Design a protein around this ligand. Structure first.
Ligand SMILES: Cc1ccncc1NC(=O)C[C@H](c1ccsc1)N1CCC(O)CC1
Ligand SMILES: Cc1ccncc1NC(=O)C[C@H](c1ccsc1)N1CCC(O)CC1
Lengths: 304, 304
């Protein structure tokens, strides 16, 4: 009973967080095996944040300029390299707390947990989604760079995000663990506007199925629709188009509740057209889109 | 930038979770030092869940009947006792991962993180609040009993909740770590209706200050009010009365934003009277009450 925005347990990731300092800038690093991953903007000065040439700035840096501290103990840096927008600091000690891990590049719509950190210390954990405009609506202050996003599959942590930038509109941009930014964002203090923040339709449907499983059923109507009819409505409301792939992924939720996907689309269509009329669904007065069909199944079944 | 429902990092608590089995019932235990804490209803049979006499049922149990497993290794039970609605299983080994800890009994309005567990394994972490009717709106399935609620102050975990029951209305009831239920709830399969779920006014105000700090300012009006006038409005909308103690606790947020507490009360008064008019605040279409003034300060300052 109940449905909450739930994050993965953060323990496995807390054991990886370290502090990285270069000159006067301190941010967070991710220590996995004998490598510490951190945003390359740790090497940047204030007078050159507008147009930094990272290859040129990195030439002035040596192994001893990267100060890596794990808890209150210093790690010895024996190598450093730049991979896209991340630095990889080879240390002389493998992290004894290295969990089983993978690096994955997620697609928009996919959710993940963020372990927000400052000075290599965790402050909190929250659930996020890669928005369709490749931003994330996080909670990050100065010093949070290098904090990571991840998913967990039993004992394996799939790292998907590393925090790099705050856009002038208070939304967030970052990279996968290969240093490639999600979206068109660049690690420089320049005008970077985000595109349309559309709603993740498949996630809203999954959340409506979670609502039905938990007893919130007022929004269920006597209607049905087609993928094409639904998508005309979705386009009007800045919702992502629904594909047959999305219909297939919602299959288990459709099977559990006995509500066909296209019937749930018709319910969503009426909620978009009429609003909630001051009513709520799973304690929300808006349509939640940061639960994937996988998250709903996981939470509703109790996967550990 | 940004404001999220954030949980404490769960690592310190994950290292305490164990599985406790008595007969055919398996639930979660909290292993701190050489004691495992778990709900006493682990000893109950199905044919006696209506009116169990726990003292009498416990007489038929011995140390060897409580199976405690930490990871995949079995703990040896050398003593057992009942303290209110929790059992304390003395084991022969101190938990090597025991964090610094305290047991606290929280008041309604206070928030905490829950590490939901099944079979002694963590499934997720989410943020909760002790409702004014002493229930919690959690996300718990069968097998989640013994999962705990907690707050963290740097290196010290203050355990405040242990999950025991699901009420017929899908809300949750449990105890502090001394085994005393929050509210009037009892650990038996009987009719237990919850009282009025009123809104935690001081928390809503704190969240409105967080909204102002993060740029959502449309709701700020040209008005002010008094504690007495505000409280008449709060009573009408099933909001908890605001006291001078609450005004004092909001002081730091008032000082940071330059918005007097009574002016923020007047803004809240107009939001209650007029609604949001299809607008949102910190991505919510309703007034959020599960952030305390302390949580807002913590998140907005970056405490680790
Ligand atoms: C400030 C912040 C808040 C929340 N999340 C992230 C950040 N950091 C940034 O956006 C990085 C950026 C940068 C550094 C090197 S090249 C570009 N940033 C440094 C801080 C500075 O005040 C203004 C530029
Ligand atoms: C089922 C559940 C879901 C979410 N959170 C908690 C629970 N468990 C309970 O409410 C405990 C209760 C009990 C056991 C011993 S005396 C009373 N409960 C066992 C399960 C049973 O089906 C019906 C009674």
């Amino acid at each position: 009973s109940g449905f909450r925005k739930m994050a993965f347990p953060s323990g496995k990731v807390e054991g990886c967080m370290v502090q990285v300092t270069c000159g006067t800038t301190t941010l967070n690093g991710l220590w996995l095996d004998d490598v510490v991953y951190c945003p390359r903007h740790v090497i940047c000065t204030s007078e050159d944040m507008l147009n930094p040439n990272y290859e040129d700035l990195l030439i002035r840096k040596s192994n001893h300029n990267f100060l890596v501290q794990a808890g209150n103990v210093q790690l010895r840096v024996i190598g450093h390299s730049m991979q896209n927008c991340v630095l990889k600091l080879k240390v002389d000690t493998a992290n004894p707390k290295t969990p089983k891990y993978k690096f994955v590049r997620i697609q928009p719509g996919q959710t993940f947990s963020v372990l927000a950190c400052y000075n290599g210390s965790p402050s909190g954990v929250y659930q996020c989604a890669m928005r369709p405009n490749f931003t994330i609506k996080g909670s990050f202050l100065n010093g949070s760079c290098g904090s990571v996003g991840f998913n967990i599959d039993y004992d394996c942590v799939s790292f998907c995000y590393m925090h790099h930038m705050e856009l002038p509109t208070g939304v967030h941009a970052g990279t996968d663990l290969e240093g490639n930014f999600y979206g068109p964002f660049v690690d420089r203090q320049t005008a970077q506007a985000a595109g349309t923040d559309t709603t993740i339709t498949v996630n809203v449907l999954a959340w409506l199925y979670a609502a039905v499983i938990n007893g919130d059923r007022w929004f269920l109507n006597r209607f049905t629709t087609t993928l094409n009819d639904f998508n005309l409505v979705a386009m009007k409301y800045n919702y992502e188009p629904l594909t047959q792939d999305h219909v297939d992924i919602l299959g288990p939720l459709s099977a559990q509740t006995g509500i066909a996907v296209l019937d749930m689309c018709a319910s969503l269509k009426e909620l978009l057209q009429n609003g909630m009329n001051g009513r709520t669904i799973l304690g929300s007065a808006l349509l939640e889109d940061e639960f994937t069909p996988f998250d709903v199944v996981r939470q509703c079944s109790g996967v550990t």
